[PDB]
UniProtKB/Swiss-Prot annotation:
Belongs to the heat shock protein 90 family. The TPR repeat-binding motif mediates interaction with TPR repeat-containing proteins like the co-chaperones AHA1, CDC37, CNS1, CPR6, CPR7, HCH1, SBA1, SSE1 and STI1. CNS1, CPR6, CPR7 and STI1. Homodimer. Interacts with the co-chaperones AHA1, CDC37, CNS1, CPR6, CPR7, HCH1, SBA1, SSE1 and STI1. CNS1, CPR6, CPR7 and STI1. Interacts directly with the substrates GCN2, HAP1 and STE11. The lineage of its organism: Eukaryota, Fungi, Dikarya, Ascomycota, Saccharomycotina. The chain holds residues 27 to 210 of 709 of the full protein. It comes from the Eukaryota. This is ATP-dependent molecular chaperone HSP82. It comes from Saccharomyces cerevisiae (strain ATCC 204508 / S288c) (Baker's yeast).
Length: 184
């Protein structure tokens, strides 16, 4: 809801904190994409909510190993147990991280570019299995990640521009980076 949107933004900011961290050891790490931001792009025609951040990103190996493990461990039974009982929360106490995305979306794509690798696309349909492929279809990003949620039919309110603007309006004081919204 509004809390979920807020959590997604706070979650995106972690990737920005991490690239800034690497930056303390090697300034070059930040230089590939000096613009630090969080940008939300509703795409109602596709029933897709997109959140991009210019954080540290993930390499192919990190996509397969980390997200691959999340998808594999996220069996139909597990998600079922998660569904109802605790509802949501991605971050904070009683947060379930990436799994909560599967509660709002049936398909999830993670486009990612790390300074140490090329641009790739990770994807999974309600967990179970996942894929990773070299990106030859989306926009090229300097660094970071585009998390693309294909919203479930009963959760389309996440595409509402007015709702999103009110969220970023009162949450941009809890995040150290600008939160931008793409208005279509």
């Amino acid at each position: 809801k509004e809390i979920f949107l807020r959590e997604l933004i706070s979650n995106a900011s972690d990737a920005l904190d991490k690239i800034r961290y690497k930056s303390l050891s090697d300034p070059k790490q930040l230089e590939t994409e000096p613009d630090l931001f969080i940008r939300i792009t509703p795409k109602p025609e596709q029933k897709v909510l997109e959140i991009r951040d210019s954080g540290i990103g993930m390499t192919k190996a990190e996509l397969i190993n980390n997200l691959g493990t999340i998808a594999k461990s996220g069996t139909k039974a597990f998600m079922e147990a998660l569904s109802a009982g605790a509802d949501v929360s991605m971050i904070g106490q009683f947060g379930v991280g990436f799994y909560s995305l599967f509660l709002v979306a049936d398909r999830v794509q993670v486009i990612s570019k790390s300074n140490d690798d090329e641009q790739y696309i990770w994807e999974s349909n309600a967990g179970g299995s996942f894929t990773v492929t070299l990106d030859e279809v989306n926009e090229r990003i300097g660094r970071g990640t585009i998390l693309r949620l294909f919203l479930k039919d009963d959760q389309l309110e996440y595409l509402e521009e007015k709702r999103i603007k009110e969220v970023i309006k009162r949450h941009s004081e809890f995040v150290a980076y600008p939160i931008q919204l793409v208005v279509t």
